[PDB]
């Protein structure tokens, strides 16, 4: 499939950017996670980024770390995450679905088998949080063999060598934390994922030349605040995502 390319071609035709929320799968539970995700799509997310709960989330801030313990406190396993993903894709055929993974879950039972399972359930991209581009070869290759876009993080410090590696190696989108040199090097469209919390920041990223903005923790925040209020969780999620996406048009 080519969901990311079709999405960016359509967003360009509409002269708008992407808004992509992150959520941890199974947070606070499988049932309510599924409803949370449908609310985000309902509210107007252009793509998703979904986390699989891992015993040691090294690259996660405090808000993200709490999401994983909530999911473990619910019993969420990687196998249950992949059944969730197949159910999400069966309801939503065109939205791009990206996974944010830790390397051990990808490597555990074979790298190729992991990306094969991603292709089977209809995942579009995988970002492996603790695999730098210098270590990425077997992951990139297995991803491309199963029509999965390997996503790379372009950090703020990135020198020119890293820019050309990220531009050459990534697909789908470039995870940004620079825009002109990525475009110059024909990189995947950049999504700013650094401190995306306000509709103004979405508009400021599109104006900077980015294709869109990833809000990697603001959604997780809204979930954490309304645990004893599932209905108001979904209504608060809906209003925020709507405000962020309107800022992209």
């Amino acid at each position: 499939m080519e969901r990311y390319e079709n999405l960016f071609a359509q967003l360009n035709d509409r002269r708008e950017g992407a808004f992509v929320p992150f959520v941890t799968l199974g947070d606070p539970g499988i049932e309510q996670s599924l409803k949370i995700i449908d609310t985000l799509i309902d509210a107007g997310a252009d793509a998703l980024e979904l986390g699989v709960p891992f015993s040691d989330p090294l690259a996660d801030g405090p808000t993200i770390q709490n999401a994983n313990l909530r999911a473990f406190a619910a019993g969420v396993t990687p196998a249950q995450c992949f059944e969730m993903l197949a159910l999400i894709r069966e309801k939503h055929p065109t939205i791009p679905i990206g996974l944010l993974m830790y390397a051990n879950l990808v490597f555990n039972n074979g790298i190729d088998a992991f990306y094969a399972r991603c292709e089977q359930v209809g995942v579009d991209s995988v970002l492996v949080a603790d695999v730098p581009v210098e270590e990425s070869a077997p992951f990139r290759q297995a991803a491309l063999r199963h029509n999965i876009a390997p996503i790379f993080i372009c950090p703020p410090n990135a020198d020119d060598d890293l820019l050309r590696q990220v531009a050459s190696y990534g697909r789908g989108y470039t995870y940004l934390l620079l825009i002109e040199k990525l475009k110059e090097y024909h990189a995947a469209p950049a999504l700013q994922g650094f401190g995306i919390s306000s509709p103004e920041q979405v508009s400021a990223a599109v104006r900077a030349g980015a294709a869109g903005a990833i809000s990697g923790s603001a959604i997780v925040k809204i979930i954490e605040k309304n645990l004893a209020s599932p209905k108001q969780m979904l209504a608060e999620l809906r209003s925020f995502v709507s405000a962020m996406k309107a800022a992209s048009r």
């Binding site: 690259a59 879950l105 603790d130």
Partner: protein
């Protein structure tokens, strides 16, 4: 791009978020520079001699081996300032921090030995030291320090946008390159002295050198200078806990599977679906779910052999050394002594010259051992 090979065979690497690669590259370049700098080597040697107390003694154990054909020596890292081998490499990493123009230190610790090692080195060299997830707590505070597998996840978090100012003082020969290499090279005087000392006393190399293995720093420190001496056996001793059969142990190298965690590809204890399991040992210092990649490599090629020793075997060796040599060993170190005692006792007419790395002293363990002895009766 790196100056040095980040892998030992298939094991090792730099499996960290992209944002930490500049810190690792900076550290590797400073280390390579420092190893060629006679002034750095002289300053490190000065600290090891005049502050830490090197060289440490090599103690013969005639009382323990009487009536057998085993000769047993203990390399006395328990006599190092701070009470364990950890002091060697925190002094070197603290000098590397200063070489890079840095003035803050971040660390974590299980048995407290490394956290207290990080605190004392930081106090001596004027570094601001902050420790995550540690008696030991009061020592670190006395020494001016602002104070778990997740402990190892605590510091990386800060070292994130910190490394321009601070240095992460990793406490064992594990983690992402260059740490397994740096920690080996800053511990290898253990084996260098042992070789010179055994030669002087016995006129020949040991038949085997034996060391406990958590992450692997005291063992690789003892092993390194003997790796090219093909007749010298290298024996690493992992914690068997309550027994490998119970699953409550710390022996991933023997009973575990390769995975990727803590910045490295290495054997680890993990669930069937790749969650990192919790280890167990009577000794907090061996309570580590993985092992340094050079040990995994040395095992894979057959150069080093790895065994396990249970809590009860370690306890018996602890008591044996106390009563027959008047030395109170760390419970970590008692695992290595226990395996040597087994080599002797199983084959008492085998002629063998053995060195046990006595990685630390066991004052820290006397409460723990007292409660077990009393609970037994």
């Amino acid at each position: 791009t790196t100056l040095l090979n980040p892998y030992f065979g298939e094991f090792g690497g730099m499996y960290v978020p992209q944002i930490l690669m500049p810190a690792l590259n900076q550290l590797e370049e400073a280390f390579v520079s420092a190893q060629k700098d006679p002034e750095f080597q002289a300053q490190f040697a000065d600290l090891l001699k005049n502050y830490a107390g090197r060289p440490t003694a090599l103690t013969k154990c005639q009382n323990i081996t009487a009536g057998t054909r085993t000769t047993l020596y203990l390399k006395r890292e328990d006599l190092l300032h701070g009470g364990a081998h950890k002091t060697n490499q925190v002094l070197g990493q603290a000098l590397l921090a200063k070489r890079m123009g840095k003035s803050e230190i971040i660390a974590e610790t299980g048995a407290g030995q490394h956290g207290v090692a990080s605190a004392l080195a930081s106090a001596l060299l004027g570094l601001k030291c902050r420790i995550y997830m540690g008696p030991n707590v009061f020592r670190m505070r006395l020494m001016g320090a602002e104070v778990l597998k997740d402990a190892c996840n605590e510091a990386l978090r800060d070292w994130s946008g910190s490394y321009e100012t601070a240095h992460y003082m990793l406490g064992t020969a594990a983690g992402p390159h260059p740490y397994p290499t740096i920690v080996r090279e800053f511990q290898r005087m253990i084996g260098e002295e042992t070789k010179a000392q055994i030669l002087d006393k016995e006129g020949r190399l040991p038949d085997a050198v034996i060391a406990c293995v958590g992450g692997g720093s005291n063992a690789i420190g003892m092993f390194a200078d003997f790796i090219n001496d093909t007749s010298v056996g290298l024996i690493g001793v992992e914690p068997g806990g309550h027994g490998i059969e119970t699953g409550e142990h710390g022996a991933p190298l023997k009973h575990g599977r390769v995975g990727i965690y803590f910045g490295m590809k290495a054997p680890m204890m993990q669930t069937a679906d790749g969650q990192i399991e919790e280890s167990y040992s009577i000794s907090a210092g061996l309570d580590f779910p993985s092992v340094g990649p050079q040990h995994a490599y040395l095992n894979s090629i057959g150069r080093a052999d790895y065994v396990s020793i249970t809590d009860d075997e370690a306890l018996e060796a602890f008591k044996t050394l106390c009563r027959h040599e008047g030395i109170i060993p760390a419970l970590e170190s008692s695992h290595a002594l226990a395996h040597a005692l087994k080599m002797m006792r199983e084959q008492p007419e085998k002629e063998q010259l053995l060195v046990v790395n006595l990685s630390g002293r066991g004052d820290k363990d006397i409460f723990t051992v007292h409660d077990i002895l009393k609970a037994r009766g």
